[PDB]
Ligand binder design. Structure first.
Ligand code: GSP
Ligand code: GSP
Ligand code: CL
Ligand code: CL
Ligand code: CL
Ligand code: K
Ligand code: K
Ligand code: MG
Ligand code: MG
Ligand code: MG
Ligand code: MG
Lengths: 483, 483
């Protein structure tokens, strides 16, 4: 199927995502949305029986999600339902009402399969290979243990934002009683890990709060890294704030009434898992469902050196992809030839290579200021499998090809672990020279270094590359000569 | 063909552009560059005989231009040569040298054909119907009188930057004698007009100086508007400035030694033509050659309401047109139904409709912050046939969909002729509401207004559009009801 829709019927949000497959492993999100259906509303006092008005909302929302699926030409529609529906004594009647109302067939999935879908999404689309997912939803919480990219254990707990809200916080029961109820279940998690992968609306909402509080310069939550020890006190503080204080923190209206129980659950989980770093995930069940299919014949794992963001970016914006292979190759040779001078950690060849592949991507928008467009593309869409640092470096290399990187760059100082200006200027200068040298179909280039003299060996005239040489911004005083 | 390279052998710059046809009328630039070949160097003192080292440069640049054309898989290569080559007693040996060196067939064109090509580009790719082109090159200056989109007269004058530089300025001849010489040729221009279309490197260079001088917020040469009366004195001053003063003004190193001649010629032309408004053209001879082929069967003119930037942007990023056509339709209806309240000039329906078509273009990059990506695409690539004002308005409409436009927005204050903030907030709100209503293919919507009450008439549940109603930002107090 070229276009596939996933519908994730949660206990609070119902989510929709439309995926377009661009190659064997390349894909991107054509459309996504979520609706605050809260099918679980009022069910927890009636033995999980889904109530009439909430069921009516679900049907109406699901009908429009189906319309959206067909509006985008989906060849397949996969619909899964989690905690509130699987717990519900009348679950089979709701499934039947939905089928009769719109022809959608719902597959109730158990907690372990829900944990797996979140694990699959995070194991493949984040930048850490090992860790534990935390998928806090309105009705349940899933944790999947991931080790070097493979799922090793799945657990689902019957604690969720709306469950806690209706059983405890709505009744003005002391928050201590809710914490105990949560801890009693969180005790059952049989594993610990320095890394956690934060999944779901509570955690993404909390991540937006933290980004705003610390004036974070990158506006995308997929991959945002949270120091769990530093921030656990604030997370616990959120549990007891009132609605207007949450508003001042930036929480949107629709999320005000569930975020505090959600924050309580997250705090108990993080304490138990001994998490030190939580990475915010922009993906979860709906993406994992799609990947279960995409990767069904590949053991639910992208092959080594297969990155779906990189690949889909090239399918969308660079389908004649040999030029960029040459620039990458020359960037490698240049980096080796100059290593006596720059002595930069070869870990940064990773970023240089990718900037080599992507630096002319923005010409599909305009050939004027093309590198500025490439940088924009890279910063906003090179997401799966890249840290924010990885993205910022690659972005800067492309953005400042043939230019001086400012001292005052927000992205460059995004973190104290970022590479130095000089290192960034070196890699950008290398990218620039490689680009100049690959302008034509010049072949068999060789670089030698003697003192501060770079010599470019070629039997080609390289007339245009020689003409452009003075427009390079060198990282240090260095002479470039053509032999 | 699909991919077409054009090479324009000027007397100073030699330019290359690779065009990609995406549809019957859609196209965009795959690649472009220019090389300071200056084939005319030293020819003016030897009756126009092209000199040996300049010809060698040309052969070396043109052989690599051919390589670039083939690298991009050009099916057709169109190569024309202008003043210095057409004037040269040895023109036929240079042409044959180039043919033997790389198989490029140079077609020497006379001054009228040169004026025609610039005219075709400007008549089609600029936003004014009538005016006179001013194409100052190294050897000659062309003017094409355009009226209502149609070429009515062509003249070529033997004044250019390198000609004047070598005949007068290089010899420390009083600038007065050079002006007198130019005035004698400009005298032959038999027409006048309030509008001028600026073509070539001199005028683009001057436009960049002016954009920097005035802290202009849109970094885009194409379409930039220059008050010729207010700036003529500054243009004339440029003629008397030193290299380093030109550097301080931002002039590129390669442009320093020709811009003063070019400014002298331009000031004389603007005075004679009575120009009050000059529009900087990002296109010229090379685009005119491509268009004369593209439009060979359409009398060198796009059909009414055919805009190649709009179309090509949709070809590249929106190969599915029916969604965006629905949003535009609702934007028109909403506009008309709300006009008792907003009372906005109907001239702005033009921008609203195009924002309706393009507002979700950016989702091809990311579905998160998609409207921000769309605005970026529009501001940087919606160029042919649009003023900077048109581009800015359309950009802002998409950018601030479902948001409040800040009071201090740089683009919004780009010029005093911009629409008011309130008008802009109105248009954005209409777009936002249209977008909500077209989420699903809600068919046959109708609108009525009573006082400040908008009533939406539908047979649809419009469940999701209602769920989103509170996130619209209204321009004035307004009640929205569904019947
Ligand atoms: N699952 C997931 N949600 C995200 C991600 N990034 C943002 N969100 C959330 O998704 C919702 C939509 O954000 P966003 O897409 O930026 O606005 P929008 O309503 O679709 O309007 P737009 O994108 O056309 S500008 C917000 O609630 C945001 O907090 C992500 O990477 N993954
Ligand atoms: N003919 C034409 N030239 C332009 C236009 N805009 C800018 N230029 C000129 O073309 C040259 C390159 O512009 P530009 O493409 O932004 O830099 P670049 O060297 O190619 O580097 P990049 O685009 O990969 S970031 C400069 O001489 C600039 O003034 C335009 O619209 N038309
Ligand atoms: Cl979310
Ligand atoms: Cl130019
Ligand atoms: Cl030009
Ligand atoms: K969950
Ligand atoms: K000219
Ligand atoms: Mg869930
Ligand atoms: Mg460019
Ligand atoms: Mg010319
Ligand atoms: Mg979005």
């Amino acid at each position: 199927a070229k276009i596939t829709t996933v519908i994730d019927i949660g206990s609070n949000s119902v989510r929709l995502a439309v995926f377009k497959k661009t190659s064997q492993f390349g894909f991107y999100l054509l459309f996504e949305t979520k609706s605050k259906v809260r099918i679980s509303e009022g069910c927890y006092a009636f033995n999980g029986i889904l109530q009439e008005i909430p069921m009516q909302r679900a049907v109406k929302a699901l009908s429009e999600f189906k319309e959206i699926a067909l509006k985008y030409k989906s060849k397949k529609i996969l619909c899964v339902a989690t905690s509130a529906v699987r717990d519900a004594p009348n679950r089979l009647e709701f499934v039947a009402r939905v089928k009769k109302a719109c022809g959608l067939q719902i597959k109730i999935i158990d907690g372990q399969k829900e944990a797996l879908y979140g694990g699959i999404a995070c194991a493949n689309l984040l930048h850490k290979n090992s860790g534990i997912t935390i998928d806090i939803g309105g009705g349940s919480t899933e944790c999947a243990l991931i080790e070097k990219g493979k799922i090793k254990d799945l657990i689902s707990l019957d604690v969720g934002t709306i469950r806690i809200k209706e059983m405890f916080l709505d009744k003005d029961l002391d928050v201590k009683l809710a914490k105990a109820f949560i801890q009693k279940e969180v005790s059952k998690l049989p594993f610990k890990h320095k890394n956690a992968f934060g999944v779901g609306g509570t955690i993404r909402a909390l991540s937006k709060v933290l980004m705003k509080r610390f004036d974070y310069p990158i506006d995308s939550l997929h991959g945002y890294e949270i120091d769990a020890h530093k921030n656990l006190a604030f997370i616990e503080k959120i549990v007891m704030l009132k609605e207007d204080q949450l508003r001042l923190l930036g929480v949107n209206e629709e999320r005000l009434d569930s975020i505090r129980s959600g924050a309580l659950i997250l705090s108990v989980v993080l304490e138990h898992l001994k998490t030190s770093l939580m990475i915010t995930s922009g993906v979860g069940v709906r993406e994992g469902v799609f990947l279960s299919d995409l990767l069904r014949n590949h053991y639910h794992k992208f092959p080594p050196n297969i990155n779906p963001s990189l690949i889909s970016l090239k399918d969308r914006f660079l389908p004649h992809e040999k030029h960029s292979q040459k620039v990458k190759k020359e960037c490698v040779k240049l980096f080796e030839a100059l290593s006596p001078l720059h002595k930069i950690d070869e870990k940064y060849l990773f970023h240089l290579k990718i900037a080599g592949e992507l630096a002319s991507m923005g010409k599909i928008l305009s050939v004027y200021l093309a590198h500025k467009h490439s940088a924009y593309f890279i910063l906003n869409a090179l997401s799966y499998g890249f840290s924010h640092q990885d993205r910022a470096i690659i972005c800067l290399l492309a953005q400042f090809s043939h230019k001086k990187i400012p001292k005052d760059n927000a992205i460059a100082h995004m973190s104290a672990m970022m590479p130095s200006l000089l290192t960034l200027q070196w890699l950008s200068f290398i990218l620039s020279l490689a680009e100049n040298l690959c302008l034509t179909d010049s072949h068999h280039l060789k670089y030698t270094l003697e003192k501060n003299k770079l010599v470019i060996h070629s039997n080609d005239a390289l007339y245009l590359a020689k003409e452009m040489l003075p427009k390079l911004v060198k990282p240090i005083p260095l002479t470039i000569e053509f032999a």
